Design a protein around this ligand. Sequence first.
Ligand SMILES: CCCCCCCCCCCCCCCCC[C@@H](O)O[C@H](CO[C@H](O)CCCCCCCCCCCCCCC)COP(=O)(O)OCC[N+](C)(C)C
Ligand SMILES: NC(=O)C1=CN([C@@H]2O[C@H](COP(=O)(O)OP(=O)(O)OC[C@H]3O[C@@H](n4cnc5c(N)ncnc54)[C@H](OP(=O)(O)O)[C@@H]3O)[C@@H](O)[C@H]2O)C=CC1
Ligand code: SF4
Ligand code: SF4
Ligand code: SF4
Ligand SMILES: [Zn+2]
Lengths: 63, 156, 331, 144, 379, 115, 29, 56, 176, 96, 208
Amino acid sequence: QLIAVDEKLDITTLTGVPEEHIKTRKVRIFVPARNNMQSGVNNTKKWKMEFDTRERWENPLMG
Amino acid sequence: SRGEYVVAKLDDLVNWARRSSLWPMTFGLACCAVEMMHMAAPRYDMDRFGVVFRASPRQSDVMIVAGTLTNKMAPALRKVYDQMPEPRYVVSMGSCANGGGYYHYSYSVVRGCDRIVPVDIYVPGCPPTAEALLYGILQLQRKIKREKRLRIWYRR
Amino acid sequence: LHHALIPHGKGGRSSVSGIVATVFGATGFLGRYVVNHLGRMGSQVIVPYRCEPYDTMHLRPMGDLGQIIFMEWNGKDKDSIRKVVEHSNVVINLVGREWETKNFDFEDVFVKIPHAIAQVSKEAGVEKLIHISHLNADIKSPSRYLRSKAVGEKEVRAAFPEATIIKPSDIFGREDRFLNYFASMRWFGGVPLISLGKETVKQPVYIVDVSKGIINAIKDPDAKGKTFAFVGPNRYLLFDLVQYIFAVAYRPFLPYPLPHFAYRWVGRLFEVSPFEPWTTRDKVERVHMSDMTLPHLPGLEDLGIQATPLELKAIEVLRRHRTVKPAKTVN
Amino acid sequence: ELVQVLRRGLQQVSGHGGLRGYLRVLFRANDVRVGTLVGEDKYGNKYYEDNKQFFGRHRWVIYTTEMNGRDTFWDVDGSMVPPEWHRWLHCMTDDPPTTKPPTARKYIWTNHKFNVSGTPQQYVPYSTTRKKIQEWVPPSTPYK
Amino acid sequence: NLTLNFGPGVLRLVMELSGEMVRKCDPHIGLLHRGTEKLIEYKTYLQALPYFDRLDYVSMMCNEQAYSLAVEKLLNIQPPPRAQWIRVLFGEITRLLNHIMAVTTHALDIGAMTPFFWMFEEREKMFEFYERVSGARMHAAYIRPGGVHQDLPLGLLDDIYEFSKNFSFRIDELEEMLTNNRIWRNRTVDIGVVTAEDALNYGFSGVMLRGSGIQWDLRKTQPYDVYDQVEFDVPIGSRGDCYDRYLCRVEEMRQSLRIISQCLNKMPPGEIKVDDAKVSPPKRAEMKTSMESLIHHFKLYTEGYQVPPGATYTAIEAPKGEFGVYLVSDGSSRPYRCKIKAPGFAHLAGLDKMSKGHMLADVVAIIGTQDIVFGEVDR
Amino acid sequence: GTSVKPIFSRDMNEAKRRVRELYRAWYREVPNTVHLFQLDISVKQGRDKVREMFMKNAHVTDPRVVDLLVIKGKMELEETINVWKQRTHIMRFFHETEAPRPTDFLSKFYVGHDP
Amino acid sequence: ASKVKQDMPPPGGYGPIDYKRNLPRRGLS
Amino acid sequence: ASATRVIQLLRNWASGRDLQAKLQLRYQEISKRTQPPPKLPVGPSHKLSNNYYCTR
Amino acid sequence: TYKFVNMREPSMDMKSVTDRAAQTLLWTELVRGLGMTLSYLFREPATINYPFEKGPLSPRFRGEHALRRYPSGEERCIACKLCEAVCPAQAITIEAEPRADGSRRTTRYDIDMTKCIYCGFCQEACPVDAIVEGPNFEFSTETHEELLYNKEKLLNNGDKWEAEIAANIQADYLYR
Amino acid sequence: GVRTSPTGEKVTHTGQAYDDGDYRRVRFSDRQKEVNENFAIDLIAEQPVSEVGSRVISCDGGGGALGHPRVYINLDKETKTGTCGYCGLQFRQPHH
Amino acid sequence: TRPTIRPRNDVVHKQLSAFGQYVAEILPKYVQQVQVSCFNELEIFIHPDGVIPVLTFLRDHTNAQFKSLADLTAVDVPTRQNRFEIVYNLLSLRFNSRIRVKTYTDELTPIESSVTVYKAANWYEREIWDMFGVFFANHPDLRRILTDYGFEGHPFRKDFPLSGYVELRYDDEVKRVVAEPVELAQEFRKFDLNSPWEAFPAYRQPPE
Ligand SMILES: CCCCCCCCCCCCCCCCC[C@@H](O)O[C@H](CO[C@H](O)CCCCCCCCCCCCCCC)COP(=O)(O)OCC[N+](C)(C)C
Ligand SMILES: NC(=O)C1=CN([C@@H]2O[C@H](COP(=O)(O)OP(=O)(O)OC[C@H]3O[C@@H](n4cnc5c(N)ncnc54)[C@H](OP(=O)(O)O)[C@@H]3O)[C@@H](O)[C@H]2O)C=CC1
Ligand code: SF4
Ligand code: SF4
Ligand code: SF4
Ligand SMILES: [Zn+2]
């Protein structure tokens, strides 16, 4: 009833993500730093995963 | 001259005939269609303007996009638009059809029906009132009155 | 490079390509493809029109919000040309007509208007000008169309010494006047060809190839004062080309040799009509005349484009003309 | 009976200033009803009321034939009504601007404008902010 | 056996027919899937409220109430009594609007178009009530998770009373057009019969249950707000077909008139939102005079109120059936998950079984009797 | 250890058998799809596209992932055969309107900051 | 000073509201 | 309603109901579009004392 | 309590059977429906004469947006960005900086009218009554671009509609 | 207080105007540029300074609840005048 | 508690607790946990193997007979080794009660389809498969129900981007609707709203 197959988990072929958004991205795993404007520490409890910043430009209309 | 004065009269007659009988096929995609149904209701009576109720696509003159256009839905709307006889116009009704509206940042929503078909009139509102849609229809009538096909042909 | 014209984004609909193009004759057959290719990469297109706004409506979805601006103009007025090209860094000339009207002959369309456009663009400080002529343009051609084109090239080069001249050869496509003209002969029964269509050789070129060539000529830095010849990969005798066209359309083929003088008379009759003519004296002479060969001119391959053969797109063009054995080529 | 409605129709004919005015109102508004003149607009629009009609038909406007720059003899639209008569006409209030006028402000438009879409007076969007990054200007004098 | 794809509310329907008989009916949906449930995860609870107006567009007020009840349960607060009475009154008005829409459309598709206009005049009057109370005719956002946004204007109750004392004659005219007409009965009687056991197993709710004789109504069994303080009857069918459901809907409208009368006569005084400035925003004058009111206004309109962590499933007796929300809060001011339960989803999933062995023209009648609004089904 | 519940196949061999069955079905279907949708592609390049889509997932060594991919491919074939897809859906596999993205370092450096 | 004024039903309530079906029989055997 | 007596009788006989008692067109019976100002009382938490938030 | 809608048994006596046969043969209920339609033909229609007559509205009605100012002529908006924060559609874009006299004012205030859902959350979140939803609903357009309002358009709308907007606010503010 | 750019365009109250080489000006040809003619800074600069014999004064913008939040302004500094942070009205004590 | 606070109901709380203990006693093979919320809602956390038995019991037992399936959905929690939690909401008309049944699964482990217990599940599981990628074994016909044909991915997953990866337009050169990588003229504005200074001390977690 069990296979017991030995291999690291990989679901990339099932998530539908385009190829250049898997291998070219660099995620950062970190506990966010406390906002120095305040003393509350409730925003520094969990871990966050975020992606690398890409290009942002100006819309020729409306800027 | 006679030639330039005659083309103007014929253009006026054809424009009056075309704007006095606008037969719309209504794409009732979402809540905006309800307000469209309130403009055919007795209080506003679209039919009294010459605007027939629920025209067939093969004999329709104006397309009214009333509601959100999803990605799954866009090819069929384009196909219906391609099947309309040549003197055709498109009226975009509501924020969803105009620019995506409340679902602008959605994975499954076309951000404005002008990405698929060219649009003649944009009717703002979420939803526009039946009165606002009637105003947009009358604006389309004025825009049709302003156009001049025979003068361009004569001068070309 | 004027920071507002610095390219940004990933070359898509809402990107910025740094190109501000005024496309004269954008409401025609090649104009729609040129505008679509310009707008899909995020350039701003100024479209000067003389017709009815309704006839230009199909160009609206080709660009992002605000990226396509429509402007009224007429070729007899230099001020409209000036106001339409004030802010562009690219000017593309696509104005043409295959017949003469009571208001515009070949001289106005192919000589005076291109010269005015080039002069006004040079005075306005436009960086790049791209003018379209014919492959078979020469001052001694029997047809006034081609002769006018040759004259037009001379005046455009004189007014804009850094202009890029492009010489296509009988563009074929979905809205073309080549395959559709040859396939529109079914109504008249047997096709009429001077000398049974066995004496003229054609080298047709795909519309998308020409449009991409114009785009890449815009992109190419050293294609300033060059002249290009856009031709297809294969040359065909006209007889076998028309036979292939009719075979693809599933239509019966009945070609009969016709006297040149007789053909000219037929062409003249069509011309008198107010509406656009199926054929004209100049048209029958232009399709009877063989395509030139200019090996010294840089080609479409020099712009990084592999020309697509007619066999791949003939079905796309001619499927609507219905209700396998490609033709033999000569090279 | 029949004579009463006949007399009312003839009185409607007579109350518009004769056959010429009757035809004018009939062909301009598709209506021949007569009501008490509530007010007159500075652009020429006239505002009438009749409380005996059902809600929605008890207030109406006869549009002027010449607004800012266009002949509005045939081409009338709802955006030609100024804001005060707009509030009265949509039954947002029971009081016409004649009996109580709106508060006067220096910045309020003295001349109302209609919908100017499809017109050289149309609105064109643009960014209202200034340059964010300033480019370095190279010196004009040669270095060597 | 021929296969037809009746493509583009907006519905794609793939059928296999053996002659005139419908052998298989397969609805393809998603033509109005806008990803509402994913979009809600990027909004505060107040910001997420207006999506429920657009879920089932025909009856906007009821969805607002269901969402507000779920959020109130998660917040451990209760709305003031006047807010509850206003909510129930406008829910019954909403029911009348939905019923008129469902009945007229069903008739119009069936080929009878006269009552559509006759009752859309009344629909326009009820839109006027909506607009006078909220400023919008149909996408109202009036019912909030703390009560209601604004109090009624000083003349609204009288106008609602004037409207409601003339509506029974309109229902009588609709019945004169429909109930005893032999063509209407032939189009509706013995069409789309569903048994009680099948209706329960297929997830049906509302009239789709009560037409088969099931005595169930959430306003009676699991009352919310003040529905336990009003008296009305639950119409029950006997044959489980389209005709009995039409009769039930017509009867329901009359009952709604009864409940509206009771709501009008027993409207209490007091405030309209919970007197808790950490949930409901304060008044404008308080916001412009008091430091705490200004702070709470600022925070409620920028961050929003935090909802304690937990998950609830809240359902109400909607005009189209049981309408529910499974709401999961993680403790912040944005919902972690919002699953919307729509009655029309299960009804359309049962369309295949309901249309077995019928004409092609009976499929239209069955779709009309299921009361299907696409926005709620696709979300 | 590392014992997991199966989906359809116990080891890789059954998974490859399912993959081959799906590949046969797609290969058979390609010409009929070309004719029915009035595609301007050829049967040869359609089968090349099928081969390329299959080869995109050639590195999977997990039978559960393999038969999940087989399930998805069978769903896609079901959509194609029943003509639930339109011409645009079929032609989306070819990306005919996208300008090609150069791969070399210099071109990417010229066009922008994106690696 | 001033008392509360909000939208309330009139004293004594509203008049009765008909809701029963009224489908009279015209009368002919 | 500005309807003649004969037309009222004809429509009453045709429908079988008395139309004049319950008309579907609004008239002067509706409320005025200009209303006096309201006062809108305050809720139970507007007390000055014995109103600590921790108890509510 | 509950009610039966279709639990009546037809009588089987000869008179009732003859009545049903007479209905079947002489088409009585169809004539009743014809009479109902005929009665509806002779009553006054409910149609209004747009654009000369308009549908009723309320002071609370939300129309085209406007930016208001104080009686002195200075704008009310102080760039707090509460309307931008609360906007359920992210239709508001705001940029601000100190003015030449040190005042806290906006340099950019855009509303994408094709993303707006006209919910009115902005006007109730505003602490100074700067952004309002004015009574105008007849502002249809021939292009998508003219529906992307900048600050100049909104200030012009405010100066255009201020009289009616202030009257509506005076009517409705005691409910807010 | 609308001014004119050297090119010919009206300078808005935010001070924006396309430079001479800016292609975006093409959007205004055959059309117009929307500019508000009432400049708030000039309009508020025209209001006279109120003379009050109090050390601290309250301002709500006028109109009661139709104004802005009520704020208190200190007038101890004689070199300058107190300015409302919401409305821009100026207040001053009667020096000499 | 004063008028602004929701009133409690201890009778329903006791009844739901007793019935939860009863259910857990009858099926100890599958029931992992039983909870009653402070607003009187009963949830039963079970092992994935017990989906068919437990549901069947809750549908067919004389004392339970939860004959209605109100809703079936999934929740995505990326931090858990088993990513998805499957939620069944059941209604009993005989006893006027509601129950919730929760189980779990990951990207690759199938869950037994419950169409044999409730017909209403047929579409619900389909929607789950469309939105979360959870496979249901022995489903009569499992396929997408909400997304466009050929859509790649499962949008309701947390890591799926809000605007997706592709967008649609009409191309005149190919004369058809085409799909291209997404490009927004205005990027969605991400708001950081969570404040420090925790709101609810009763839900505080140990500092580990
Ligand atoms: C016997 C031979 C027949 C040959 C074929 C002829 C076919 C029939 C043509 C005759 C029909 C007459 C046309 C009627 C048009 C008059 C309508 C007029 O009132 O419209 C106004 C006039 O506007 C235009 O000027 C009208 C232009 C129509 C043409 C004018 C005369 C041209 C006749 C030339 C006929 C020669 C035929 C030659 C070929 C055989 C504008 O009103 P409009 O804006 O809409 O409505 C606004 C809505 N409001 C009123 C509620 C505010
Ligand atoms: N086979 C081919 O198509 C070939 C074409 N070429 C050249 O390429 C160019 C584009 O060809 P194609 O797209 O087929 O041309 P089209 O005839 O399709 O369109 C030409 C454009 O020029 C405009 N135009 C024509 N005459 C005038 C005038 N007097 N004043 C103002 N504008 C005018 C037209 O506008 P409007 O619609 O308003 O009249 C039209 O948009 C032509 O100049 C042609 O010489 C060269 C070789 C082969
Ligand atoms: S535009 Fe607004 S009212 Fe119309 S369908 Fe979309 S959300 Fe609903
Ligand atoms: S009305 Fe609502 S959607 Fe529109 S700008 Fe204001 S807050 Fe945003
Ligand atoms: S309009 Fe009002 S809410 Fe928006 S930024 Fe200005 S002051 Fe703040
Ligand atoms: Zn102040």
